[PDB]
Amino acid sequence: IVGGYTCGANTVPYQVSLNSGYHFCGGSLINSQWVVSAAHCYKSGIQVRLGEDNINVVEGNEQFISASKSIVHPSYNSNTLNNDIMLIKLKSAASLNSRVASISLPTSCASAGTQCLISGWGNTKSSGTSYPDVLKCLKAPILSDSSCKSAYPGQITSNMFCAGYLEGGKDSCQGDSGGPVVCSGKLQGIVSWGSGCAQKNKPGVYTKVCNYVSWIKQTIASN
């Protein structure tokens, strides 16, 4: 997250870190057994780390649970990033509590102008590189479809929205991918892509979660 703020330990209780020897992506806990992330974060050998604040120090609220199964969306295209969503099932159920909690799925799509919270352990610089230990947060609005398309001609599908600041300075970045965009207590986005971070006229692009609720529910119901 570039241009954000320190969230505070365990104030984003649905935020998980995906670890394969090291943090590599975010995700969002949606029930005691299942995490939402980005399909471009797929790999084998994932350990899900819940209850994290400083991802390099054991602080006492973590739960580490290995994935039993990953399911990439049926229509994911890794060239266009269309349908950039996957589900990850945990080998055992997380203990839910005030610091490890699931986030509700949307019941309708959010509109441009809605305020949201984006969070993650990604890079905090727009030139160069610095990775934080503790979780970073950014409040950002959803941008209109039309400004998102004009920002990225030929690349925004109906399964994507933009959020952030056309002026630049405040955005998600590398290592945030797969993490949450939560608006009014609902998971409306997943950190997906952009062109650099925090550049003028290049806001972040996010997977539009409301399009996937019936796939998420039916997948959980049978897996």
**Catalytic amino acids?**
40, 84, 177
In the set 171, 180, 187, 188, which binds ligand SW1 (CB under 6 A)? Answer: 171
Nearer to ligand SW1, 27 or 51 (CB): 27
The least distance separating Ca ion from the CB of residue 56, rounded to whole angstroms, comes to 7
Binding region for Ca ion (CB under 5 A) out of 51-59, 64-72, 133-141, 147-155: 51-59
User: For ligand SW1, which residue of 160, 186, 204, 216 counts as binding (CB under 6 A)?
Assistant: 204
As measured in angstroms, the least distance from the Cβ of 111 to ligand SW1 is 21
If one asks whether residue 197 binds ligand SW1 (CB under 6 A), the answer comes out as yes
Shortest Cβ 47–Ca ion spacing (Å): 13
Could you tell me which stretch among 52-60, 77-85, 109-117, 190-198 binds ligand SW1 (CB under 6 A)?
190-198
Closest C-alpha among 109, 178, 108, 167 to residue 140: 167
Using CB distances below 5 to 8 A depending on partner kind, what does residue 172 bind out of Ca ion, ligand SW1, none? ligand SW1
193 binds ligand SW1 (CB under 6 A): yes
User: For the residues of the chain, what is the DSSP string, one character each?
Assistant: -BS-EE--TTSSTTEEEEESSSEEEEEEEEETTEEEE-GGG--SS-EEEES-SSTTS--S--EEEEEEEEEE-TT--TTT-TT--EEEEESS----BTTB-PPBPPSSPPPTT-EEEEEESS---SSS----SS-EEEEEEBPPHHHHHHHSTTT--TTEEEES-TT-S-B--TT-TT-EEEETTEEEEEEEE-SSSSBTTB-EEEEEGGGGHHHHHHHHHT-
Q: According to the binding rule CB under 6 A, does residue 36 interact with ligand SW1? A: no
Binding residues for Ca(2+): 52, 54, 57, 62
Binding site for ligand SW1 (CB under 6 A): 171-174, 176-177, 191, 193-194, 197, 204
